[PDB]
Each structure stands twice: as C-alpha cells, then as structure tokens.
Design a protein around this ligand. Structure first.
Ligand SMILES: Cc1nc([C@@H](NC(=O)C(=O)Nc2ccc(Cl)cc2)[C@@H]2CCCCN2)sc1CCO
Ligand SMILES: *[C@@H]1O[C@H](CO)[C@@H](O)[C@H](O)[C@H]1NC(C)=O
Ligand SMILES: *[C@@H]1O[C@H](CO)[C@@H](O)[C@H](O)[C@H]1NC(C)=O
Ligand SMILES: *[C@@H]1O[C@H](CO)[C@@H](O)[C@H](O)[C@H]1NC(C)=O
Ligand SMILES: *[C@@H]1O[C@H](CO)[C@@H](O)[C@H](O)[C@H]1NC(C)=O
Ligand SMILES: *[C@@H]1O[C@H](CO)[C@@H](O)[C@H](O)[C@H]1NC(C)=O
Ligand SMILES: *[C@@H]1O[C@H](CO)[C@@H](O)[C@H](O)[C@H]1NC(C)=O
Ligand SMILES: *[C@@H]1O[C@H](CO)[C@@H](O)[C@H](O)[C@H]1NC(C)=O
Ligand SMILES: *[C@@H]1O[C@H](CO)[C@@H](O)[C@H](O)[C@H]1NC(C)=O
Ligand SMILES: *[C@@H]1O[C@H](CO)[C@@H](O)[C@H](O)[C@H]1NC(C)=O
Ligand SMILES: *[C@@H]1O[C@H](CO)[C@@H](O)[C@H](O)[C@H]1NC(C)=O
Ligand SMILES: *[C@@H]1O[C@H](CO)[C@@H](O)[C@H](O)[C@H]1NC(C)=O
Length: 339
C-alpha cells in the first residue's frame, strides 16, 4: 500500500572524478554511482493520477541546478537586491551530463508508461522504479535541447490550455538538429545557428496540426515574441560556458507551411539570471571555434489572449521559468510512500 508523498531525493550519475568539467565535479561530490541493473516492477491493474505541474521533484532538481551553477558559474560582477558582488570569473569546462533522481528507503518512484500521456490525469500502464532516467540539466528558453523525445505522437502539455498565462510545452517525437557556431577566424561575439528548413517546417506543421486538435480546429499562427527581456524574445542557451542569444524569427515564420536556416546569434556577457536573482556579467568569449550541435526535442510556447472572437490562435516562443524545462523530463514521475 502507498500514498502520494514528498521526500528528500538523492541523485545518481556516471560522473568522472578526474574530469574538470563542472557537471562532473558537482555530481562527483553530490551524487552516487548509477545502478547497472536497476529493478522495475510493472503494476498490474493499477490506475495512478499524475500532475506534472504540481510535482516536488521539479523543485528539487531546480535546487540542484542552482547549487551547481552557484559553485560552477560565478560571474565577474553580480547585481542582486541593490548589492554589487565582484569576484573572479575564470573560464570553465562546461557540458551537461545525465542526472538520475532517486528515492530513499520507504519510498519509490511511480512511472507512467502511457504512450501519449500529457502529464496530468490518470495513468494506466504504471511501473515502479527507484531512479528516474538520466536527465541533463540543460538550461534554455524557447527551444528545449538534448531532451527525451515523445514515443508516439507529438504531445501538447499545459496546466490549463484555456489559460493563456500558462506556458505550453510541446513535446516533439522527432529530433531536429540545431548547429550553433561562433567562428574562430571581426566580431568575437557574433555567432549563428544553422537548421535544416525542410525538417523544421515539416515538424512545425505537425505541431500545428496537433495544436488544432486541442483548439477546436482553429487556425494556428506562429509569431515572434512581441516584447520582453532578451532571454525570452530570443532563444537563449549555454554552449561551452558561453551564453548564446539567437534570433528565432525565421523559425516561427508561418509562410513556409526548404534550404538551410541560418539564425543570427550573439554571445552575451551580461545576462538576466534564470535563478531569479538579478543581473550578472561574465568574461568575454574564449578564443577559437565555439560550437554546439544540439537536438531540439521540445518547444515552449505562449498563446496570445483576446482571440476568442476570431478563428485564429497565435502562439509565440517563450519560457524563462527553467522549472518548465525539468517538467518536460519529469512529467511521468511521482513519489509515493511505501506503507
Ligand atoms: C525572478 C525571475 N525572473 C526570471 C526570468 N527568467 C530569466 O531571466 C531567464 O530565463 N534567463 C536565462 C535563460 C537562459 C539562459 Cl541560458 C540564461 C538566462 C523571467 C522569465 C519570464 C519573464 C520574466 N523574466 S525567472 C525568475 C524566478 C524563477 O523562480
Ligand atoms: C497500455 O498497454 C496496453 C496493452 O499493452 C497497450 O495496448 C496500450 O497502448 C497502453 N495504453 C495506454 C493508455 O497507453
Ligand atoms: C490530459 O489528459 C487528461 C486526462 O488524462 C485530461 O483531463 C486533460 O485535459 C489533458 N490535458 C491536456 C493538456 O490535453
Ligand atoms: C540527439 O538526437 C538523436 C536522434 O534522435 C539521438 O540519437 C542522440 O542521442 C541525441 N543526442 C544528444 C541527446 O545529445
Ligand atoms: C510524430 O507525431 C505525429 C502526431 O503528433 C505523427 O503524425 C507522426 O507520425 C510522429 N512521427 C513519428 C516519427 O513517429
Ligand atoms: C483554465 O483557465 C481558464 C481561463 O483563465 C479558466 O476560465 C478556467 O477556470 C481554468 N480551468 C481550471 C480547471 O482552473
Ligand atoms: C555545424 O556547422 C558548421 C559551420 O557551418 C560546420 O562546419 C559543421 O560541419 C556543422 N556540424 C555538423 C555536425 O553538422
Ligand atoms: C477538425 O477538428 C475537429 C475537432 O475540433 C474534428 O472533430 C474534425 O474531425 C476535424 N475536421 C474534420 C476532418 O472534419
Ligand atoms: C530578429 O531579426 C529580425 C530581422 O530579421 C529583427 O527585425 C528583429 O528585431 C530581431 N529580433 C530581436 C529580438 O532582436
Ligand atoms: C518569412 O517568410 C517570408 C515569405 O514571404 C519571407 O519573405 C521572409 O524572409 C521570411 N522571414 C525570414 C526568413 O526572416
Ligand atoms: C534537409 O534534409 C533534407 C532531407 O530530408 C535534405 O534534402 C536537405 O538537403 C536538407 N536541407 C538543408 C538545406 O539543410
Ligand atoms: C547537446 O548534446 C550534444 C552532444 O553531447 C552537445 O555537444 C551539445 O553541446 C549539447 N547542447 C547543449 C545546449 O548543451
């Protein structure tokens, strides 16, 4: 017998003790080795309710990533609550590794295995595990990178689709690569991201059709963000320790619904911290070619309000709440107390 419960989780990883990469260093001191032969019990005739939007596992992972960034990514200058902190800001080795979240004795993790599970409601095909799958703490906005893919159809996730103030998580079932490079050999902060237009437009059209199913067959329109901070209006992410801000106007341009799409990007030293603190300034980019090839596995969308009396619904790429990023991977898990 069991019941829904919150408890202090621990983590597991395959981090290397000799590696200087900061995720490896953090996990070496904060996690245990993974289980090579993890047990999983599939529960027969069991119906369990899940709520990805109210899941303490998300808050706990958030706390890990914050602590990781606090120890690994201290800026030269920090601006918090009127205070000004000036510390050393050396260049680091940065590349996220998978992190497993696990329950202690007396508790287990219930895993929903329903193929098109949207994150809320009952789940039929439920299994029991001690640890989640390996989740890379990839911090980004607009586009979810290097995540897990949906098994069957593209999944739309929201705490309340009718509420346009609630973020929409689109879970892709097909990866689309994004190739971002700050070239080595005039503007050291100038960069770009290349994406195959054929793949992207094909996928975005599939997302369009899926959104129609959730919005009574209304016409789905994509538009670039209207306003706000650069972290939201642009696709922001971290590559090799460097913060990249990319213009995704070409990606959300309804007309193409075939060549290579080259997004204009820039490496920013001054950033609005995703931790919710204030602003921070980092050192200028390292020398040489800075390159990251990522899979786009999900999209964060915000729907416009005031469209009830029209046949259109307008969606714009958004984000900013990094907890939504962890939700996109933790949606199928919940902790129960074994009694
Ligand atoms: C105070 C606070 N501000 C937050 C803001 N979010 C961010 O600054 C942010 O994501 N920055 C960000 C994102 C990605 C990368 Cl690689 C680096 C920085 C929000 C986003 C939505 C609109 C307003 N800005 S998140 C947060 C607290 C969250 O608990
Ligand atoms: C659950 O499992 C059944 C039988 O294996 C399978 O046919 C079905 O796709 C699953 N149902 C759901 C709700 O995902
Ligand atoms: C998800 O599925 C549940 C039923 O399991 C349903 O009540 C809810 O409306 C769905 N949410 C979305 C985002 O479609
Ligand atoms: C990128 O996606 C591909 C194809 O879906 C997958 O094989 C690979 O593991 C992914 N790479 C990551 C997660 O870095
Ligand atoms: C992805 O999901 C869509 C439905 O959302 C489906 O039509 C398509 O076949 C899926 N693609 C793959 C490769 O499974
Ligand atoms: C979803 O949001 C809409 C608009 O804010 C609201 O009218 C509705 O009551 C919400 N649904 C729930 C279950 O709270
Ligand atoms: C990424 O783009 C760069 C610059 O065009 C190119 O040299 C490189 O081959 C690309 N990488 C991959 C794996 O496609
Ligand atoms: C349009 O979407 C509705 C659901 O909103 C669906 O019932 C209908 O089958 C779709 N269009 C067609 C093929 O009539
Ligand atoms: C993105 O690029 C377009 C021009 O292609 C420009 O008009 C727009 O202002 C850019 N977006 C941002 C947020 O810089
Ligand atoms: C969006 O599509 C239109 C097609 O009319 C094109 O002219 C425009 O350049 C596109 N936006 C881009 C690629 O920045
Ligand atoms: C995208 O991939 C398709 C294969 O589906 C290929 O034909 C095309 O060369 C690629 N487009 C670009 C310009 O990257
Ligand atoms: C995604 O995964 C690839 C392969 O490990 C990595 O090279 C790339 O830097 C990752 N992207 C991000 C944004 O971390």
């Amino acid at each position: 017998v069991w019941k829904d419960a919150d408890t202090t989780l621990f983590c597991a990883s395959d981090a290397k003790a000799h590696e200087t990469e900061v995720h490896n260093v953090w996990a070496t001191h904060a996690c245990v080795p993974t289980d090579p032969n993890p047990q999983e019990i599939h529960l027969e005739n069991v119906t369990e309710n899940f709520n990805m939007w109210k899941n303490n596992m998300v808050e706990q992972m958030q706390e890990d990533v914050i602590s990781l960034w606090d120890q690994s990514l201290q800026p030269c200058v920090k601006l918090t609550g009127g205070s000004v902190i000036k510390q050393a800001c050396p260049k680091i080795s940065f590349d996220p590794i998978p992190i497993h979240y696990c329950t202690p004795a007396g508790y287990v993790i219930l895993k929903c295995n329903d193929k098109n599970f949207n994150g809320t409601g009952p789940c039929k095909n439920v299994s029991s595990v001690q640890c989640t799958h390996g989740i890379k703490p990839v911090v980004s906005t607009q586009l979810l990178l290097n995540g897990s893919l949906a098994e069957e159809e593209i999944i739309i996730r929201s705490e309340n689709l009718t509420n346009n103030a609630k973020t929409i998580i689109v879970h892709l079932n097909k990866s689309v690569e994004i190739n971002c490079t700050r070239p080595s050999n005039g503007d050291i902060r100038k960069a770009y991201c290349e994406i195959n237009g054929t793949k992207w437009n094909k996928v975005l059209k599939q997302v369009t059709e899926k959104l129609k199913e959730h919005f009574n067959n209304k016409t789905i329109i994509f538009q670039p963000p209207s306003g706000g901070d650069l972290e939201i209006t642009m696709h922001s992410f971290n590559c090799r320790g460097e913060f990249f801000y990319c213009n995704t106007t070409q990606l959300f341009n309804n007309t193409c619904i075939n060549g290579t799409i080259t997004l204009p990007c820039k490496i920013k030293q001054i950033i609005n911290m995703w931790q919710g603190t204030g602003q921070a300034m980092y050192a200028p980019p390292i020398d040489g070619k800075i390159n990251c090839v990522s899979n786009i596995t999900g999209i964060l969308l915000t729907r416009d309000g005031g469209a009830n009396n029209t046949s259109n619904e307008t969606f714009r790429p958004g984000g900013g709440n990094i907890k939504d990023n962890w939700r996109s991977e933790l949606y199928k898990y919940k902790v129960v107390q074994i009694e």
